[PDB]
Amino acid sequence: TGRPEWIWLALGTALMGLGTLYFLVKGMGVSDPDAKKFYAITTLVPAIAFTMYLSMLLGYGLTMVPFGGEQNPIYWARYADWLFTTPLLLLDLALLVDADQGTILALVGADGIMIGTGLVGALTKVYSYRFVWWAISTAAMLYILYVLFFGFTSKAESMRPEVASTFKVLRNVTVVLWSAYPVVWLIGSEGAGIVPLNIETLLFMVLDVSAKVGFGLILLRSRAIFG
Ligand SMILES: *C/C=C(C)/C=C/C=C(C)/C=C/C1=C(C)CCCC1(C)C
């Protein structure tokens, strides 16, 4: 097939794999129980991304959805990735500030809605309705970000500065990166079709790699993960 976006898919696969192995190696050397917890969650995130980037590189996770008078190329494997990686990242943040079970449940649930309506919108055949689903998915994301910014930051204040400071950074990287996904979707192949797929794939790999390996490097190198 040789689609123009394959090189970014190859690069995404490469970065996710390397990040996975490094976290795995670093994770199985640590003896602290809590640190092990964080390591297991954070290593699994890029591990899942790697498998999906690899599948997409190999030609899977792609479907032609008709709308706008065109046969549009929609990479659905992405939602198969995000369905599990986004809540895991959320869990990392939750464990960090000792969030409550109710909070976590509500965040993971909002997250499920976000990815769920996102895919439904990415698969919808009525052009205008694709944006209705997109709109709902974004509303869910803003709920999650609101909670992370207003709820979590507040509870991270019961933690040590080292832990509060690590959370701030992770929270910040998350707010900035996550905020970017809906915009990429809106102007890319799933939406307005302004930004071509090859470029769109490039933007997504940069956000995904930054949001997973970037996020993991920051979290796993901190002393805040220790019991
Ligand atoms: C490793 C992957 C990460 C951190 C992915 C984050 C993905 C999002 C914040 C995705 C958000 C979306 C919307 C707000 C609406 C349209 C569809 C999505 C799923 C692209």
User: In sequence order, what DSSP letters do the residues of 155-195 get, joined into one string?
Assistant: HGGGS-HHHHHHHHHHHHHHHHHHHHHHHHHHHSTTTT--S
The answer to whether the beta carbons of residues 79 and 122 sit under 8 Å apart is yes
Query: Which atom of ligand 1 is nearest the CA belonging to 118?
Result: 17
Q: Could you give the 3-state DSSP secondary structure of residue 61?
A: coil
Going by CA atoms, what residue is nearest to atom 6 of ligand 1? 178
Q: What is the resolution of this structure in A?
A: 1.8
Contact (CB, 8 A) for 204 and 15: no
Which residue has 């709920």 as its token pair? Answer: 143
| Cα–Cα nearest to 139, from 118, 169, 167 | 118
3 state DSSP class of 66: strand
Q: Which residues contact 31 (CB under 8 A, 6 or more apart)?
A: none
CA–centroid distance, 33 to ligand 1, in Å, is 31
How far is residue 163's CA from residue 135's CA, in Å, rounded to a whole number? 34
Residue 70 DSSP SS3 = strand
Domains of the chain: 1-227 (1.20.1070.10)
Q: How was this structure determined?
A: X-ray
Which ligand 1 atom minimizes the distance to the CA of 184?
Answer: 20
Q: Is the CB of 208 under 6 A from ligand 1?
A: yes
**Residue 211 in contact with ligand 1 by CB distance below 6 A:** yes
CA-CA-CA-CA torsion sign (48, 52, 58, 61): positive
Tell me if 47 sits within 8 A of 27, measured CB to CB.
Answer: no
CA 215 – CA 132 distance, rounded (Å): 31
Nearest CA to 75 among 142, 144, 12? 12
**2: which DSSP letter?**
-
In terms of C-beta density within 10 A (0-12 exposed, 13-18 middle, 19 or more buried), how is residue 121 classed? buried
Whether the Cβ atoms of residue 132 and residue 126 lie closer than 8 Å to each other = no
CA distance 73 to 43: 30
Instruction: Kindly give the residue spans of alpha helices, DSSP state H, lying in the chain.
Output: 6-27, 33-57, 77-97, 101-123, 127-146, 153-155, 161-187, 197-209, 215-220
Alpha carbon distance 88, 44 (integer Å) = 8
Cβ of residue 23 lying under 6 Å from some atom of ligand 1: no
Instruction: Look up residue 75 and give its DSSP letter.
Output: E
Ligand 1 within 6 A of 86 CB?
A: yes
For atom 1 of ligand 1, the residue with the nearest CA is: 208
Backbone angles phi, psi at 124, to 5 degrees: -65, 135
Ligand 1 center from residue 32 Cα (angstroms): 32
- Quick check: 110 and 100 in contact, CB under 8 A? no
Q: What count of other Cβ atoms lies within 10 Å of the Cβ of residue 211? A: 24
For residue 115, give the ligand 1 atom closest to its CA. 19
For residue 140, the ligand 1 atom closest to its alpha carbon is 14
Spatial CB neighbours of 130, under 8 Å, sequence gap ≥ 6: 67, 121, 122, 124, 190, 191
Determine the Cα–Cα distance for residues 159 and 204; give it in Å rounded to an integer.
Answer: 33
Residue 94: how many other CB atoms lie within 10 Å: 22
Nearest CA to ligand 1 atom 12: 182
Q: Among 42, 176, 181, which is best to mutate for testing ligand 1, by the most ligand atoms less than 8 A from CB? A: 181
Q: Which two tokens stand for residue 140?
A: 């869910």
Q: Does the beta carbon of 141 sit less than 6 angstroms from any atom of ligand 1?
A: yes
**Angle, in degrees to the nearest 10, between helices 161-187 and 197-209:** 170
Residue position matching structure tokens 């709308």:
67
